[PDB]
Nucleic acid binder design. Structure first.
Ligand SMILES: [Mg+2]
Ligand SMILES: [Mg+2]
Ligand SMILES: [Mg+2]
Lengths: 63, 40, 59, 49, 46, 282, 59
RNA sequence: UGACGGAGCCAGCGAGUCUAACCUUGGCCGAGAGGUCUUGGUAAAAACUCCGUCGUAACGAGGAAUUCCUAGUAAGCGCAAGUCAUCAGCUUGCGUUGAUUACGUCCCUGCCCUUCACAC
């Protein structure tokens, strides 16, 4: 890997973030990127719940 | 309900970037914690 | 343990929940058992007996 | 006993095993569990020696 | 995820609570203790 | 052999017990030295101890790595054997190979029907310094135990989120230079103990321009392990993962070889105590 | 009571070797010989047993 | 290099007053709580040696590629335990039977190191 790294850098001037399978006849997904979105989406959802816990009013916008 | 122990940390992209920068800084300063041969 | 939960999906929610026996032996809900539905595995700080009853304190 | 009512110091009666589980035996309480734990550790200590 | 949030919040609330009790206990001892020792010295003077 | 190891260990255990007793006397000699230099009066207990003042005359001329490693720390390179549980699945065998490549002086030995007491005795004869055993669950590594010969300690870890290099396509071959070691955020006394165990697994004195770095980063007692190869550029340094990735969390540490289930426990994980989640020990 | 495993039992130092007594199954000649006084003396052997049982429990 | 039955025989780990089902049909007693019984269904050492008998929709040992492995090793067989992390969709121990092929070479592919006598 290191020799390939040197060759690329002299030309210009992380393969473990991808889950890759083998063609029985290839990159299959993005664990780190997917988990960040899947974890953040529930994180803003949790923030909504803690805000909603002790409220009886709320803004009613009919526009 | 209560939980007895913290869940195992998830390796999201941001955590890797936090790890990545720490490694980059240490190499740049060239400070590593490695065994040093004794004299004599 | 048995009779705490009616399906494995319920156990999935309560995995890692703290539980204790009447005797005072603290424990944890580790994982849901595939067969039969609702059974699960729990690890206690010490060996429990059959006469004991496990309790999950919820609100 | 100072500044304490007698009502505060009321015996809390302690329960029994359920009838459905009555076959298995006596519902152990904390005092019962302590006797087990000490007994096992005493034997294990000598067995280790 | 809910497990991580609950534990962190409990620890923070526990840390803050212990901070408050320590503060109000120490301040009472320091300020009132001074007045007590001051008064005890006047009575000894008498 | 067997007699000497028993005799040596008994001598060590006696020495430690005396040193704990001698700690009080060591503090007392420090107080005497400070008073003589500064001129402050001695405390009453020291002022009245005639024996200590006489014995201080001889003891005036008295002056780190852990004791077990002190003898050979930085003198002899370590010798490591990496093995597995009985009837290992294929994935664990690949994982065991990766751990063998991680440590420069590791050798992969097949555990088919080897008895554990026989295993340590064979390794102790052959001068092996450290032994590593790996466990697995459905082809996913779960545990890792490190035992330092001739008399311990044995450190057991649990591995999480393991991602092997075999899961990478066209990864290539590793470099096997003496790697640079990074140990970050180890503060407590236990943390220093864990660092010492992991540090001595590597050969001493890596070359200054060695382009392989191994980092053990503690983040909430979940020690992250990463392996990288770096290139120093004109405006910074660029690094690339070589793998494998895994997070290893200590859950036991015993003063003895892994065979001895009776070894005194230096530290264990107490998961059911009330304040378990509150504090992080490493 | 504690039951020491035989493997640990076998390799014990001479000073600390637990004396475990095997029961006798073949009737010994002396056991077939001794005469036991019955009738009046039986009533005078139970009674001393009854007295000593009370005295220990009282103490 | 089968199936059925019988016979012979060989292990080592392991010892907490602790060890372990569910749903029904009914009799009787009991103020109740419950107690006892009755009843149908569901679930839950092996290898080895010898002797005797029969008999040779999907799939018949799994392509290309790719991975691992050098002695009590590969492979086959069962028995225990569940030891604060993991594990029962299983994990770890224990014994039994036990091989073929290499143990050389730097030719290819990678990684690495170098530029106090006598003799050279
Ligand atoms: Mg095998
Ligand atoms: Mg098997
Ligand atoms: Mg296995």
């Amino acid at each position: 890997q290191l020799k390939n790294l040197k060759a690329a850098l002299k030309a210009r001037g992380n393969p473990f973030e991808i889950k890759a399978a083998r063609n029985k006849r290839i990159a299959v997904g993005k664990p780190g990127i997917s988990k960040q979105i899947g974890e953040e989406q529930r994180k803003r959802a949790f923030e909504a719940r803690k805000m909603m816990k002790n409220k009886r009013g709320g803004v009613i916008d009919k526009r | 309900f209560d939980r007895t122990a913290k869940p195992v940390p998830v390796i999201t992209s941001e955590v890797t970037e936090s790890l990545e920068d720490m490694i980059r800084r240490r190499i740049q300063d060239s400070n590593f914690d490695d065994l040093q041969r004794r004299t004599l | 343990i048995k009779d705490m939960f009616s399906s494995a999906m319920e156990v999935a929610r309560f995995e890692g929940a703290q539980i204790k026996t009447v005797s005072g032996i603290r424990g944890e809900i580790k994982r849901a058992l595939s067969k039969p539905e609702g059974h699960y595995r729990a690890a206690f700080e010490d060996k429990i007996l059959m006469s004991d009853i496990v309790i999950l304190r919820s609100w | 006993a100072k500044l304490v009512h007698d009502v505060q110091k009321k015996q809390h009666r302690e329960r029994s095993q359920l009838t459905s589980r009555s076959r298995y035996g006596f519902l152990e309480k904390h005092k019962d569990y302590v006797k087990r734990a000490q007994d096992f550790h005493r034997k294990q200590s000598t067995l280790k020696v | 995820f809910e497990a991580r949030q609950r534990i962190e919040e409990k620890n923070k609330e526990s840390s803050d609570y212990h901070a408050k009790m320590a503060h109000i206990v120490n301040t009472i001892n320091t300020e009132e203790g001074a007045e007590k020792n001051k008064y005890e010295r006047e009575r000894k003077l008498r | 052999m067997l007699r000497r190891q028993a005799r040596e260990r008994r001598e060590y255990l006696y020495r430690k017990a005396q040193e704990l007793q001698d700690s009080q006397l060591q503090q007392k000699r420090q107080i005497i030295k400070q008073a003589l230099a500064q001129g402050k009066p001695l405390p009453k207990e020291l002022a009245e101890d005639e024996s200590l003042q006489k014995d201080f005359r001889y003891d005036q001329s008295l002056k780190q790595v852990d004791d077990e490693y002190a003898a050979t720390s930085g003198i002899m390179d370590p010798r490591i054997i990496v093995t597995t549980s009985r009837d290992p699945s294929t994935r664990l065998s690949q994982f065991a190979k990766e751990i063998k490549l991680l440590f420069p002086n590791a050798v992969r030995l097949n555990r088919g029907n080897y008895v554990m007491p026989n295993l340590v005795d064979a390794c102790k004869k052959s001068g092996t310094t450290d032994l590593v055993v790996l466990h697995e669950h459905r082809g996913v590594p779960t545990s890792l135990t490190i035992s330092h010969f001739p008399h311990g300690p044995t450190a057991q870890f649990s591995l999480h989120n393991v991602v092997m290099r075999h899961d990478i396509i066209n990864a290539g071959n590793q470099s096997e230079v003496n790697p640079h070691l990074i140990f970050d955020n180890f503060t407590t006394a236990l943390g220093k103990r864990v660092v010492c165990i992991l540090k001595h697994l590597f050969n001493a004195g890596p070359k200054k321009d060695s382009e392989r770095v191994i980092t053990f980063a503690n983040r909430g007692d979940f020690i992250s392990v990463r392996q990288h190869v770096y290139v120093r550029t004109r405006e910074g340094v660029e690094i690339a993962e070589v793998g494998p990735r895994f997070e290893m969390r200590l859950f036991e540490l015993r003063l003895g070889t892994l065979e001895n289930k009776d070894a005194d426990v230096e530290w264990q994980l107490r998961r059911f105590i009330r304040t378990a989640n509150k504090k992080d020990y490493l | 009571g504690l039951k020491v495993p035989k493997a640990v039992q076998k390799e014990l130092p001479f000073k600390s070797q637990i004396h475990q007594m095997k029961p006798q199954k073949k009737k010994t000649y002396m056991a077939k010989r001794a005469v036991v006084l019955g009738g009046d003396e039986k009533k005078a052997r139970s009674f001393i047993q009854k007295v000593l049982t009370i005295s220990k429990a009282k103490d």
